[PDB]
Amino acid sequence: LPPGPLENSSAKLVNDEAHPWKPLRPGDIRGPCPGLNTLASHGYLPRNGVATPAQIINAVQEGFNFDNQAAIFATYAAHLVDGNLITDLLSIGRKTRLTGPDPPPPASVGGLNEHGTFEGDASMTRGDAFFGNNHDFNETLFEQLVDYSNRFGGGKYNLTVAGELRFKRIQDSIATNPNFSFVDFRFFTAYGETTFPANLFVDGRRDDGQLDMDAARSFFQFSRMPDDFFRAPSPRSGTGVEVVVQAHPMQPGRNVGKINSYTVDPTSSDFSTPCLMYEKFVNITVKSLYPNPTVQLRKALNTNLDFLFQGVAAGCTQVFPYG
C-alpha cells in the first residue's frame, strides 16, 4: 500500500550517520531527478538506483519532506509508465534487467530515463533528449542556472530565478529542438520541478527559499546533501509554482518538426484543467503502453492506477481504462 504521511514532519538532520553519501559503484543507476539521485546516494533508497514505489515514497518523505499526495502521484505516475508492474520495481535512471522480465511491447519499462513518459524537455540542468542525453548533469546548463541566480536571485536560486530560467529553457528548446514537446504531464512537471530546489534543497532550519550555489551543485551534480543538511520543516512539493507561471505564462504545445514552429495544442491539459491531465495520463499514456494486458498485468495496472488516484487532488473523477 502507498505509505501515509510522516508521523513527525519536523526539520531534522537527514545527512546522518545511517545515511552517508557514497560514490557510485559499477552498475549503480542515477537518472534525471536530483531528488531521487540524492536519496539513492545517501541510502534512503537502494544505492543501485532500483526501488519499489513504496520505497520511493518513504524516501522522498523521510529525506526531503516531500508531501504525501505529491509523492504518491509522482511515484505511481512514474512507475506506471517506466517501471515493471509485475515485479514492483522502478529504475531511477536507465533501462535495466534488474527490474525483471519485461512485459510485451509496446510497454518500454525504460526507467526514469525514458523520454516522453515522465522525463521531458526544457529541464534546468539536463539537456533535451534530441541533443543526445536527457539524464546526466550538464555543466553549461548548470552555469546558466548560476548566471540566472546571480541576475535575479542575488546569487541564490529562488522563485524569481525559477520564473526566468523556466522561460529561458523553453525559449532555447523552441529555437534549437525541432522535436520540442511541452504538453500534458510534462507541461505540469516542468513548472513544479523549478520550485523544488527552493522548497526542498534549502536547509530546513532556514526554509527561506534562497538556495546557495554550493548546495545546488552538490545536489544537481553529485547527488549529495551538504554536510549537516536538515530537511524542510514541513511537508511540501510545489509551493510557489504560481510565481514561476506568472513570470512568463505559457500555453502547452510543441515544435512541429522544425525549430521556431511552436504550435499550441488545444487538446492538451493546462493549469485550468488539472483533472484532464490525470484522465489523459491514464486513458492515453498508460493505456497506449498496455493496450490489451493479460490478466496479471491488468490486475497490477488497476492496483497502481488506484494508488495514483490517491495522489490526485480532490474533485477529480477516477477513470477506469480496464474496468
Judged by beta carbon, residue 233 or residue 321, the one nearer ligand NAG is 321
Q: Which residue is nearest to ligand NAG (CB)?
A: 154
User: Which is nearer to ligand HEM, 21 or 320 (by Cβ)?
Assistant: 21
With CB under 6 A as the contact rule, the residue among 3, 19, 62, 66 that binds ligand HEM is 66
Task: By CB under 6 A, name the binding residues for ligand NAG.
Answer: 127, 138-141, 153-154, 158-160, 209, 276, 279-280, 283, 319-321
Closest approach, Cβ 124 to Mg ion, in A, equals: 9
Residues 291-310 that bind ligand HEM (CB under 6 A): none
Smallest distance from the beta carbon of 292 to ligand HEM, in angstroms? 27
Segment near ligand HEM (CB under 6 A); pick from 13-21, 119-127, 302-310, 314-322 = 119-127
**Binding of ligand HEM by 193 (CB under 6 A):** yes
User: Mapped to the 3 state alphabet, what secondary structure does the chain carry?
Assistant: CCCCCCCCCCCCECCCCCCCCCCCCCCCCCCCCHHHHHHHHCCCCCCCCEECHHHHHHHHHHHHCECHHHHHHHHHHHHHHHCECCCCEEECCCCCHHHCCCCCCCCCCCCCCCECCCECCCCCCCCCHHHCCCCCCCHHHHHHHHHHHHHHCCCCECHHHHHHHHHHHHHHHHHHCCCCEECHHHHHHHHHHCCHHHHHCCCCCCCCCCECHHHHHHHHHHCCCCCCCECCCCCECCCCHHHHHHHCCCCCEECCCCCCCCEECCCCCCCCCHHHHHHHHHHHHHHHHCCCCCHHHHHHHHHHHHHHHHCCCCCCCCCCCCC
Is 316 annotated to bind a ligand? Reply is no
Binding residues for heme: 33
Contacts with Mg ion by CB under 5 A lie at 119, 123, 126, 134
